[PDB]
Amino acid sequence: KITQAIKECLSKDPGAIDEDPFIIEL
Amino acid sequence: KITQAIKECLSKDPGAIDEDPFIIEL
Amino acid sequence: ALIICYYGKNGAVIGGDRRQIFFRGSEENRKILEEKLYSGEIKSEEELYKLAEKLNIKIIIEDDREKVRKISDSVVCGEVRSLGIDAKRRRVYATKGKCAIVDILNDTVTNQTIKEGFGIVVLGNRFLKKKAEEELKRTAKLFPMMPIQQIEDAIKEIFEKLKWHPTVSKEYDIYSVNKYEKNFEEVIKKDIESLFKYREQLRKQLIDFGKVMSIVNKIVKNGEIGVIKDGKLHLYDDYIAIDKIDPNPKVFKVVDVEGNFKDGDIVVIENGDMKIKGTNEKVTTKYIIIHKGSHHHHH
Amino acid sequence: ALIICYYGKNGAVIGGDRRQIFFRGSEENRKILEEKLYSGEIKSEEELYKLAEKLNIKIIIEDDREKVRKISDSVVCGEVRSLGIDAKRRRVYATKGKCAIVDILNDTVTNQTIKEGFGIVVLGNRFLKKKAEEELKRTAKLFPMMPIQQIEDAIKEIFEKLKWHPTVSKEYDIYSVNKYEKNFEEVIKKDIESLFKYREQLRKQLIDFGKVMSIVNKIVKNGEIGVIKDGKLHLYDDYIAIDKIDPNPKVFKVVDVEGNFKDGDIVVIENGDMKIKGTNEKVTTKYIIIHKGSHHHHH
């Protein structure tokens, strides 16, 4: 329950990787 | 931060001891 | 939670349920549901989850642990706990003729009231204590002249009368005694001291956990660790070596190594592989290498 | 977080900030602030805390750790992480002429794209990638013919142009290389394997933490532990003894004890004091006694 709760609680930079990375081919 | 967060998160029976215990002297 | 304790010359009897309810949510919603549960408007477990679901707050009921103990043939104890920012507790101890209500905050005993005579103590939330009072107010005065068994039963009826409420588990424990404890204060002081040792142990293990994990993070993936002086790996002042992944491991500056090399050669690591700088030939060792500092590239 | 990486025959260059922002609150408010931060309407750190304060949600900024590493003279790496229910990561590796974009979910590599040629990769939130693109779209085509230093600087300007935003720390690291890595795939596989070992260690230590604490909870406060057979404490099948408070301690059924006693006497404990049943005389031992089961009175 404790290990479960911390993942349910703390959230580091959510949605920061919800989109593709930006790329350029030169 | 992690030990801090769990006490900020989980709460077991809060307010369950916010009042005096009931006593009778017989 | 609900604990009902009787004490008198006929003996001590104490009954307690096993229900603990954990909340995981925001501060306001924790406090809003917290009051609505003790307000008496919440009927059963169905409306608890359902209302908690509406407030987007998860609750976890656990009826798997006893609130009451029979320390000896002379003493019985019952504990209620309320955990949050602080770890608040309310214990009730009892024996033949005496009773002790103890109040603990974290690692300290705030209050300790001891009583000699006949009486009843009830621990719980405001709703249950209100309800329990109104059952006892009539029947309580018959307790002092009853046998133990009949009081145990009298209490059993009170639990059956109240257990429908979702702050109380449907099963409960009861323990009783009819012997007098000569050193009642000492017994309590010793039982409590165990709690503080357990909390100490818990903190000591928690410190040692991080202390081990720090070491794991200090393991060298890529570094210029030392030089082979006199057929032995002399490590720089920056790096050190350890025998095990322990919390307090033994430190080494000179280390035994096996491989193809000579004196004066520089020892390096890349991608966890220990090699000779220039040779790129594989080198082995029984010990784990780490940064001395816990700061390499910031922390 | 913001990572900008260039790769070409002239070399690899990669710049990264150090900002990590943790949220602690409810699901809706986490998602509401999460979008408002990347929406671009949030100007600076003042309106972040102030708006987070209005939503009764605490945020913790930490700029104390580098997002970018120089694995060798041939390879450089930059990592972005997003932790929640799962531990999602996005790494970018680079070297002379090649670049690798890796996608990790927990302990697995979901995607791994490697590229040969000239290009730029940017990792971050939707707002920064939008803004970074519009700086690079012009200046990027001059990169392939520039020296390394000038590209490092070109990237430095981009960080200075964007760092005002509260998803980016005011300080940043930059590392570059101009050597080709022969085994580029193997280097990456080995660097990643270290992460999975670290997560394994983390889980192994977390299991062992509890494993030790279980034992501490199994220590006998009050119990009828055994009988003295042939001048030695033979323990019942219910209880066992251990040498240390370890995660995997050595088990004992027969134990060495010192005190005044004979064969056939029952050994008991009350309030942590080991004594002879009937005698109540003090008995000592070098070993810690515990319940064999982790269940005594429910769990």
Notes on the structure:
Chains A, B: Part of a complex that catalyzes the formation of methyl-coenzyme M and tetrahydromethanopterin from coenzyme M and methyl-tetrahydromethanopterin. This is an energy-conserving, sodium-ion translocating step. Chains A, B: It is found in: Cell membrane. Chain A contains one helix and two strands; from the N terminus they run H-E-E. Chain A has one helix spanning 2-9; strands at residues 10-12, 22-25. Chain A is rod-shaped. Chain A starts with a helix and ends with a strand. The two termini of chain C are 44 Å apart. Chain C has two domains: 2-19 and 63-207, Glutamine Phosphoribosylpyrophosphate, subunit 1, domain 1, CATH 3.60.20; 219-291, no CATH class. Chain C has five helices and 21 strands. The longest helix of chain C has 34 residues, at 184-217. Chain C has a five-stranded antiparallel sheet with strand order 5-6-7-8-9, covered by helices on one side. A five-stranded antiparallel sheet of chain C has the order 16-13-12-18-19, with no helix packed on it. In chain C, strands 10-1-2-11 form a four-stranded antiparallel sheet, covered by helices on one side. Chains A and C meet through helix 1 of A and loops of C.
The CATH topology name of the largest domain in chain C reads: Glutamine Phosphoribosylpyrophosphate, subunit 1, domain 1
Helix content of chain A: 25-40%
| Tally of strands of chain C | 21
Number of helical stretches of at least 4 residues of chain A: 1
Described by its quaternary structure, the protein is: heterotetramer
Structural class of chain C comes to alpha+beta
User: Hey, roughly how much beta strand do the residues of chain A contain?
Assistant: 25-35%
User: How do the helices and strands follow one another from N- to C-terminus of chain A?
Assistant: HEE
* H/E element order of chain C: EEEHHEEEEEEEHHEHEEEEEEEEEE
Percent range of helical residues of chain C: 25-40%
Number of strands of chain A: 2
Helix and strand content put the structural class of chain A at: alpha+beta
- Name of the level-1 CATH class of the largest domain in chain C: Alpha Beta
Give the overall shape of chain C.
elongated
- Roughly how many Å is the radius of gyration of chain C? 30 Å
Largest sheet of chain C: 5 strands, antiparallel
Largest interface: C-D, 36 and 37 residues
N- to C-terminal distance of chain C: 44 Å
Family (chains A, B): Belongs to the MtrA family.
Subunit structure (chains A, B): The complex is composed of 8 subunits; MtrA, MtrB, MtrC, MtrD, MtrE, MtrF, MtrG and MtrH.
Function (chains A, B): Part of a complex that catalyzes the formation of methyl-coenzyme M and tetrahydromethanopterin from coenzyme M and methyl-tetrahydromethanopterin. This is an energy-conserving, sodium-ion translocating step.
Subcellular location (chains A, B): Cell membrane
